[PDB]
Amino acid sequence: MKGDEIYEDLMRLESVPTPPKMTEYDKRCCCLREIQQTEEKYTDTLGSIQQHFMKPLQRFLKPQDMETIFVNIEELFSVHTHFLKELKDALAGPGATTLYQVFIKYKERFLVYGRYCSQVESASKHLDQVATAREDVQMKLEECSQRANNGRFTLRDLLMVPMQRVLKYHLLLQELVKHTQDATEKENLRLALDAMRDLAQCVNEVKR
DSSP, rough: HEEEHHHHHHTSSSSOOOOOOOOGHHHHHHHHHHHHHHHHHHHHHHHTTTTTTHHHHHTTTTTTHHHTTTOSSHHHHHHHHHHHHHHHHHHHSOOOOGHHHHHTTTHHHHTTOOOEEEEEEEEHHHHHHHHHHHHHHHEEEHHHHHOOOOTOOTTTTTTTHHHHHHHHHHHHHHHHHHOOOSSSSSHHHHHHHHHHHHHHHHHHHHSS
16 A cells, blocks of 8 residues: 555656657556566665665664564565566466466465564564664664665665565456456466465464
8 A cells, every 4th residue: 555655766667757659657568577677676675685784784773673673684585586587487488377386386485474564564663763763873774775765765664665565466466367368378377366365365464
Protein backbone atom coordinates (compact mmCIF):
# COMPACT_ATOMS: atom_id res chain seq x y z
CA MET A 1 0.00 0.00 0.00
CA LYS A 2 2.46 2.63 1.21
CA GLY A 3 5.59 0.75 0.20
CA ASP A 4 4.50 0.97 -3.43
CA GLU A 5 5.23 4.70 -3.40
CA ILE A 6 8.77 3.83 -2.31
CA TYR A 7 9.90 1.77 -5.31
CA GLU A 8 8.53 4.58 -7.47
CA ASP A 9 10.90 7.26 -6.17
CA LEU A 10 13.40 4.91 -4.53
CA MET A 11 14.18 3.83 -8.09
CA ARG A 12 14.12 5.58 -11.46
CA LEU A 13 10.48 4.81 -12.24
CA GLU A 14 8.14 7.57 -11.18
CA SER A 15 9.81 10.00 -13.57
CA VAL A 16 9.05 9.01 -17.16
CA PRO A 17 10.84 10.90 -19.96
CA THR A 18 8.42 10.80 -22.89
CA PRO A 19 10.41 10.26 -26.12
CA PRO A 20 9.34 10.14 -29.80
CA LYS A 21 6.89 7.23 -29.55
CA MET A 22 7.17 4.50 -26.91
CA THR A 23 7.13 5.42 -23.21
CA GLU A 24 7.66 3.66 -19.87
CA TYR A 25 3.89 4.07 -19.55
CA ASP A 26 3.79 0.96 -21.73
CA LYS A 27 5.15 -0.91 -18.69
CA ARG A 28 1.64 -2.36 -18.47
CA CYS A 29 2.70 -4.57 -21.38
CA CYS A 30 6.34 -4.86 -20.31
CA CYS A 31 5.17 -5.95 -16.81
CA LEU A 32 7.14 -9.19 -17.13
CA ARG A 33 10.34 -7.50 -18.30
CA GLU A 34 9.58 -5.00 -15.54
CA ILE A 35 9.67 -7.73 -12.89
CA GLN A 36 13.33 -8.33 -13.75
CA GLN A 37 14.19 -4.80 -14.86
CA THR A 38 12.82 -3.10 -11.74
CA GLU A 39 14.40 -5.78 -9.56
CA GLU A 40 17.75 -5.19 -11.26
CA LYS A 41 18.26 -1.54 -10.30
CA TYR A 42 16.82 -2.30 -6.86
CA THR A 43 19.41 -5.06 -6.49
CA ASP A 44 22.13 -2.45 -6.91
CA THR A 45 20.83 -0.70 -3.79
CA LEU A 46 19.73 -3.92 -2.10
CA GLY A 47 23.34 -5.06 -1.87
CA SER A 48 24.56 -1.56 -1.07
CA ILE A 49 23.24 -2.06 2.46
CA GLN A 50 25.58 -5.04 2.78
CA GLN A 51 28.91 -3.21 2.89
CA HIS A 52 28.17 0.40 1.90
CA PHE A 53 26.15 0.96 5.08
CA MET A 54 26.53 -1.67 7.80
CA LYS A 55 30.27 -0.98 8.01
CA PRO A 56 29.96 2.84 8.30
CA LEU A 57 26.81 2.45 10.40
CA GLN A 58 28.58 0.34 13.03
CA ARG A 59 30.72 3.42 13.69
CA PHE A 60 27.88 4.61 15.95
CA LEU A 61 25.09 2.02 16.21
CA LYS A 62 26.09 -0.64 18.74
CA PRO A 63 27.10 -4.07 17.33
CA GLN A 64 24.55 -6.02 19.37
CA ASP A 65 21.69 -3.71 18.42
CA MET A 66 22.97 -3.40 14.85
CA GLU A 67 21.76 -6.97 14.29
CA THR A 68 18.23 -5.74 14.99
CA ILE A 69 18.48 -2.61 12.85
CA PHE A 70 19.40 -4.15 9.49
CA VAL A 71 18.19 -7.64 10.46
CA ASN A 72 18.92 -10.21 7.70
CA ILE A 73 19.74 -7.84 4.85
CA GLU A 74 22.84 -9.89 4.04
CA GLU A 75 21.02 -13.12 3.16
CA LEU A 76 18.10 -11.07 1.85
CA PHE A 77 20.34 -9.46 -0.78
CA SER A 78 20.53 -12.91 -2.36
CA VAL A 79 16.76 -13.31 -2.68
CA HIS A 80 16.99 -10.27 -4.94
CA THR A 81 20.25 -10.88 -6.80
CA HIS A 82 19.56 -14.60 -7.21
CA PHE A 83 15.95 -14.01 -8.27
CA LEU A 84 17.18 -12.14 -11.35
CA LYS A 85 19.77 -14.84 -12.05
CA GLU A 86 16.86 -17.25 -12.53
CA LEU A 87 14.38 -15.15 -14.50
CA LYS A 88 17.23 -14.45 -16.91
CA ASP A 89 17.40 -18.08 -18.02
CA ALA A 90 13.70 -18.53 -17.29
CA LEU A 91 12.59 -15.68 -19.53
CA ALA A 92 15.00 -16.29 -22.42
CA GLY A 93 14.93 -20.01 -21.66
CA PRO A 94 13.14 -22.47 -23.99
CA GLY A 95 9.88 -21.33 -22.43
CA ALA A 96 9.16 -18.24 -20.35
CA THR A 97 5.99 -19.92 -19.09
CA THR A 98 8.35 -21.96 -16.91
CA LEU A 99 8.86 -18.81 -14.80
CA TYR A 100 6.52 -20.52 -12.34
CA GLN A 101 9.27 -22.95 -11.33
CA VAL A 102 11.07 -19.85 -10.08
CA PHE A 103 8.08 -18.65 -8.05
CA ILE A 104 7.03 -22.04 -6.67
CA LYS A 105 10.37 -22.97 -5.09
CA TYR A 106 11.29 -19.44 -3.96
CA LYS A 107 8.77 -19.61 -1.11
CA GLU A 108 11.66 -20.71 1.13
CA ARG A 109 13.13 -17.20 0.87
CA PHE A 110 9.92 -15.34 0.07
CA LEU A 111 8.85 -16.69 3.46
CA VAL A 112 11.84 -14.91 4.99
CA TYR A 113 9.79 -11.78 4.38
CA GLY A 114 7.62 -13.05 7.22
CA ARG A 115 10.15 -13.29 10.03
CA TYR A 116 11.89 -10.37 8.33
CA CYS A 117 8.86 -8.12 8.83
CA SER A 118 8.82 -9.28 12.48
CA GLN A 119 12.17 -7.79 13.46
CA VAL A 120 12.03 -5.22 10.71
CA GLU A 121 8.75 -3.71 11.94
CA SER A 122 10.67 -3.28 15.19
CA ALA A 123 13.96 -2.27 13.57
CA SER A 124 12.67 0.52 11.34
CA LYS A 125 10.82 1.78 14.41
CA HIS A 126 14.06 1.81 16.40
CA LEU A 127 15.84 4.00 13.85
CA ASP A 128 13.12 6.63 14.27
CA GLN A 129 14.20 6.89 17.91
CA VAL A 130 17.91 6.17 17.46
CA ALA A 131 18.47 8.89 14.85
CA THR A 132 16.54 11.47 16.87
CA ALA A 133 18.41 10.22 19.94
CA ARG A 134 22.02 10.35 18.77
CA GLU A 135 22.59 13.24 16.36
CA ASP A 136 25.76 11.44 15.28
CA VAL A 137 23.42 8.91 13.67
CA GLN A 138 20.92 11.33 12.14
CA MET A 139 23.64 12.97 10.04
CA LYS A 140 25.15 9.55 9.29
CA LEU A 141 22.05 8.03 7.69
CA GLU A 142 21.88 11.20 5.61
CA GLU A 143 25.34 10.88 4.06
CA CYS A 144 25.66 7.10 4.37
CA SER A 145 22.38 6.79 2.46
CA GLN A 146 23.52 9.42 -0.05
CA ARG A 147 24.86 6.45 -2.02
CA ALA A 148 21.36 4.99 -2.26
CA ASN A 149 18.98 7.85 -1.51
CA ASN A 150 19.87 11.05 0.35
CA GLY A 151 17.67 10.50 3.40
CA ARG A 152 14.70 9.57 1.22
CA PHE A 153 13.93 5.95 2.11
CA THR A 154 16.95 5.00 4.25
CA LEU A 155 16.73 1.71 6.21
CA ARG A 156 13.55 2.67 8.09
CA ASP A 157 11.90 2.92 4.67
CA LEU A 158 14.17 0.38 2.96
CA LEU A 159 13.77 -2.84 4.97
CA MET A 160 10.03 -2.09 4.86
CA VAL A 161 10.05 -2.00 1.04
CA PRO A 162 10.22 -5.82 0.53
CA MET A 163 7.01 -5.99 2.57
CA GLN A 164 5.21 -4.91 -0.61
CA ARG A 165 7.23 -7.09 -2.99
CA VAL A 166 5.88 -10.49 -1.97
CA LEU A 167 2.43 -8.90 -2.22
CA LYS A 168 2.68 -7.13 -5.57
CA TYR A 169 4.55 -10.24 -6.73
CA HIS A 170 1.61 -12.61 -7.09
CA LEU A 171 -0.57 -9.59 -7.82
CA LEU A 172 1.51 -8.40 -10.77
CA LEU A 173 1.91 -12.02 -11.85
CA GLN A 174 -1.88 -11.96 -12.19
CA GLU A 175 -1.83 -9.02 -14.60
CA LEU A 176 -0.06 -11.40 -16.98
CA VAL A 177 -2.34 -14.43 -16.61
CA LYS A 178 -5.24 -12.05 -17.26
CA HIS A 179 -3.41 -10.45 -20.19
CA THR A 180 -1.41 -13.42 -21.48
CA GLN A 181 -3.08 -15.31 -24.33
CA ASP A 182 -0.67 -18.23 -24.61
CA ALA A 183 -0.83 -22.03 -24.62
CA THR A 184 0.93 -23.14 -21.44
CA GLU A 185 1.77 -19.71 -20.03
CA LYS A 186 -1.81 -18.50 -19.50
CA GLU A 187 -2.29 -21.79 -17.63
CA ASN A 188 0.98 -22.80 -15.95
CA LEU A 189 1.56 -19.16 -15.02
CA ARG A 190 -1.58 -19.57 -12.91
CA LEU A 191 0.15 -22.24 -10.83
CA ALA A 192 2.68 -19.60 -9.82
CA LEU A 193 -0.19 -17.48 -8.51
CA ASP A 194 -1.49 -20.15 -6.14
CA ALA A 195 1.99 -20.50 -4.65
CA MET A 196 2.93 -16.82 -4.43
CA ARG A 197 -0.56 -15.86 -3.28
CA ASP A 198 -0.12 -18.52 -0.59
CA LEU A 199 2.47 -16.31 1.11
CA ALA A 200 0.37 -13.14 1.19
CA GLN A 201 -1.70 -14.91 3.86
CA CYS A 202 1.31 -16.37 5.68
CA VAL A 203 3.45 -13.26 5.51
CA ASN A 204 0.66 -11.01 6.79
CA GLU A 205 -0.14 -13.47 9.58
CA VAL A 206 2.70 -13.76 12.07
CA LYS A 207 1.60 -14.88 15.50
CA ARG A 208 -1.08 -12.19 15.65
